[PDB]
Amino acid sequence: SELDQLRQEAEQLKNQIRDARKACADATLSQITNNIDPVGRIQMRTRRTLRGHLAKIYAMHWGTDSRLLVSASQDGKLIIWDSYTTNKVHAIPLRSSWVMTCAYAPSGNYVACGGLDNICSIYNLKTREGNVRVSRELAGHTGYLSCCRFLDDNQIVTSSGDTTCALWDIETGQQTTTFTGHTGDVMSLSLAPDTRLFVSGACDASAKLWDVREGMCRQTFTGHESDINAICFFPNGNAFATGSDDATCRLFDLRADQELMTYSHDNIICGITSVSFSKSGRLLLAGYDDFNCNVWDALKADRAGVLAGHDNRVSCLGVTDDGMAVATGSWDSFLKIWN
Amino acid sequence: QCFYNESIAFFYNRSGKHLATEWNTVSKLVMGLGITVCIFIMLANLLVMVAIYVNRRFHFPIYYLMANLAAADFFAGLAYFYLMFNTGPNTRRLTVSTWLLRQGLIDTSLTASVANLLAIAIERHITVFRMQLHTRMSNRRVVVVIVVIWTMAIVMGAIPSVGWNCICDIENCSNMAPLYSDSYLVFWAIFNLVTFVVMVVLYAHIFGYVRQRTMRMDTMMSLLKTVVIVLGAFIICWTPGLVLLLLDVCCPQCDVLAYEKFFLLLAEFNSAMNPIIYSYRDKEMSATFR
Amino acid sequence: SIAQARKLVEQLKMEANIDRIKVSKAAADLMAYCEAHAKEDPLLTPVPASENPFRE
Amino acid sequence: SAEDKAAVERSKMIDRNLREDGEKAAREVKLLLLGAGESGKSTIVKQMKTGIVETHFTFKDLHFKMFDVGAQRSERKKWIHCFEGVTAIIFCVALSDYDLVLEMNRMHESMKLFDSICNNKWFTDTSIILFLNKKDLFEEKIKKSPLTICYPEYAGSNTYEEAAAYIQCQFEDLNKRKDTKEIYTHFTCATDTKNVQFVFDAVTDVIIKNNLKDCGLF
Ligand SMILES: CCCCCCCC/C=C/CCCCCCCC(=O)OC[C@@H](O)COP(=O)(O)O
């Protein structure tokens, strides 16, 4: 009868963990940083619209250049656009038409994707004298590929519906490391600025911080009542925001090890599909199933704008590494740039 | 060798038509029934147009054709309204130019309506035979054939407004439209007839195709009802008028001055019925009405 | 069975002992970093049209 | 501005290529194959000829892409919406397992999955083709086992036709959008080699009905 007694040992561990999390709760951000009045209303106008997809758009991602972006559509295509001249720079036909994630390889030379194929396809864009061709195919995940981000030019972090994450080495093609601990489908992941830690959000209403080098889980964060669909790091690197299907965003702090603040409006009750910060971290943008994207003041949790240019579910949202604009993509088969 | 000096009096005296010195029971009767049918036409077509331009679900080629037909029927209703207040004794005050203008308005409105019916039939036939599920639609062919429709209507209404009139042929002048000529009546009648029979053949092919490709797997009853009523409205509204025109141009000493205004009222009742015949099936269109 | 709970407890005991800081200090550092970079954010302060490649 | 305008045409070329692909992608039927694992879908895939498997096959100047996702093993609520817009859903069910249990009889699990898929908010206008496989096995099984193992309310003789029709109705009753979608049932035949023909007829019916609905003919 050691299983139940270890369960109760964990119960007591959680009791004292909650006690310590309350003991460090000397005050709240709302009480502290109220001296600064609201920053004011923000309004961004659609400065571009990218057409060419003949089906739903399921994901996008910005390149470090701040000029090129990628998008994957259910029509079986992966398009690399340039947001300045709105000219389709690349259009890759995939072997499987069911894709759900993208990644642009900050190096700027590779891209990746995956989906119901349970495979992470890596496409090289060198194209010496021939069209873009699949450079590699990482296999081993037993569930759909929900998210993937190039940790380097030869390493890639992937999240799968099989409730685990994996660090792969592209050249060799094996799971260099595996991250377990999530009890639900890992839906999103976010890398830290230094690439030494990353936060993953799953359908078990939990977010987990993972060390890439060590391979263990450092801290667990809870507070959501439903599945976490998105997660983003705070620019400083000591906090992160999580968006869930419970119509709410939540900002957690690493050092505090507790829920720092919340961002929810009684008017919005739909699910959150994407989240992001501004280069300064003040503005928190969140894409919704309401066909619109909402802006929030991170420090005070007050709506400060709305983006409405899509006729269907806004599936993906992103902010460039310069913070000059924002990219939104929805099931209406169109993308849009703001500001 | 033509006469553009004498006024409507001489032309009406040429044939057996009368000038209706002043008001009469028949005059008030026709004016009232006409303005009634015009009110109904305008109200129904305005309702259909606002319904199509309010709900965004009605943003497809077939609904574009339905709205175009609604606009054509509204135009015809206003043209018949303008025809009233000028016929009867008022016709005595009209001149050649205004006479031709009135008649051309009537002709172009009704021809636009008929062409819109034919175009709706053609688009239905095209849509029924595609072997795709969704078939994302564009805005090219719909507007193409729409402008072609309005062009055909305008040309058929303007041809007699310039050169094709019995002004230059006193011997051959109609008996219902004293200034028009028999050739134009024959032309319009043949056009209406060929359009109707073409619609009949198109809908019959649709029905046969659906019957053959559904038997192996009720749709047939509803399709037959829709087709039969769509064709019956047109036939029972237009056949008497075409018969009257043909009798006028073919049979001399045929009494046609008695059944002309009522047949025109029926031809306009066709446009009165058009909006509901092509919109009552779609319960969404009915719900949008309020 | 019991091995799962054992590994979970072993990994959670590391979370139990962790460098916890007062929420006050965390909020202070957050506000400091947020107001320090407030000038470099284009979205925070809408920039004129000639400075943004998306205007024209 | 010498080559800055050149790439444009290249871009445009890509664009037009996409269009053509789109056209081709629109000229093929899309079927989603679903079942409870041992539903006999392997037999169907064979008669038509880890991750997601695709089966292409042509018949009477028509093309079909059948997608089998039986090897997912994840919460279906996350990826099911990816199949919104398929022409039809071919749902397989083995009649033989009406008595054998996985606890829970596999027939009840099949009915639960069918209720979830048919009444799903993402599948409201998509038709379902129900394939009741294992005809002769179920026929020779019920000659000694009653149908009262799965449905305790059944009443009648234990023979093939009656019980087969009973299960057909019990599966058809789960439908709630009785006015938006249909359910084309067919007990799979082995030697007749007409299952592809039944799928063809069902898809043709669905296409023609959606066509009539596009215009004001229905
Ligand atoms: C007889 C029903 C013909 C229906 C014609 C539909 C429109 C096509 C017209 C083709 C030219 C021949 C039309 C001959 C009938 C005249 C129709 C018309 O619009 O004139 C009204 C006329 O009464 C008024 O007579 P007055 O009261 O004496 O001025």
Numbering used by the authors:
A (entry chain B): 2 to 340
B (entry chain R): 23 to 239, 251 to 323
C (entry chain G): 8 to 63
D (entry chain A): 6 to 54, 182 to 234, 239 to 354
Provide passages from the article that reported this PDB entry.
Lysophospholipids are bioactive lipids and can signal through G-protein-coupled receptors (GPCRs). Here we report single-particle cryo-EM structures of human S1P receptor 1 (S1P1) and heterotrimeric Gi complexes formed with bound S1P or the multiple sclerosis (MS) treatment drug Siponimod, as well as human LPA receptor 1 (LPA1) and Gi complexes in the presence of LPA. Our structural and functional data provide insights into how LPA and S1P adopt different conformations to interact with their cognate GPCRs, the selectivity of the homologous lipid GPCRs for S1P versus LPA, and the different activation mechanisms of these GPCRs by LPA and S1P. The overall folds of S1P1 and LPA1 are similar with a short N-terminal helix capping the orthosteric binding site from the extracellular side.
On the contrary, the ligand-binding site in LPA1 shows a pouch-like side pocket. In LPA1, the long unsaturated fatty acyl chain of LPA adopts a U-shaped conformation extending into the receptor and then bending backwards. Residues I128, D129 and L132 (in TM3), as well as Y206, L207 and Y202 (in TM5) contact the descending half of the fatty acyl chain. At the bottom of the cavity, W210 (in TM5) pushes against the bending region of LPA. On the other side of the pocket, W271, G274, L277 and L278 (in TM6), L297 and A300 (in TM7), as well as M198 from ECL2 interact with the terminal ascending portion of the fatty acyl chain. The small pocket encaging the terminus of LPA is largely attributed to the absence of side chain from G274 at TM6, whereas in S1P1 it is occupied by L272 at the equivalent position. Residues, Y34 and K39 (from cap), T109 and T113 (from ECL1), R124 (in TM3), and K294 (in TM7) interact with the negatively charged phosphate head group of LPA. Instead, the main change in LPA1 is manifested by ECL3 approaching closer to the N-terminal cap segment that causes L290 to flip upward from a buried position in the inactive state and to make a direct interaction with the backbone of the cap segment. Additionally, H40 was previously proposed to be involved in the phosphate coordination based on the inactive LPA1 structure, whereas here it is displaced from the ligand-binding pocket by the shift of K294. Owing to the bulkiness of W210 in LPA1, its side pocket can only accept lipids that bend their fatty acid tail backwards such as the case of LPA.
